[PDB]
Amino acid sequence: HMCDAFVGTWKLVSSENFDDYMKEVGVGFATRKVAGMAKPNMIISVNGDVITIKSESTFKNTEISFILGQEFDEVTADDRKVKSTITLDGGVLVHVQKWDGKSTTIKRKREDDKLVVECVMKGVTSTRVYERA
């Protein structure tokens, strides 16, 4: 029951500072522009100890499956090859990606009826708000 309140289908309803976040991560112009238009569906499911997160949009369809605290390799929507670890910290899903000596953290939080995603790279944060589909 570890992630019960995250499970479901979520749709993006707002974004702030995502272009800047993508710049900070190193995404090039054309990818930023097309990725920034996307309105993804985030589909979260749990089966035993395995959590699956899908992100589906006109830009890219991605899927990760993982066990909390157990590192895995991920190819991101912007084509970085990263080492990822996802943990639960005080009810927040904390996703850290490491690649080429860099790091970014993506936090997923339930707030009222929303699922709030905060993406941070060095001093640049973006907030992406999802509602139930």
Ligand SMILES: O=C(O)c1cc(-n2cccc2)ccc1Cl
């Ligand atoms: O599927 C996603 O959630 C997604 C992820 C990105 N992204 C680019 C650099 C880091 C993340 C862009 C656009 C989308 Cl739609």
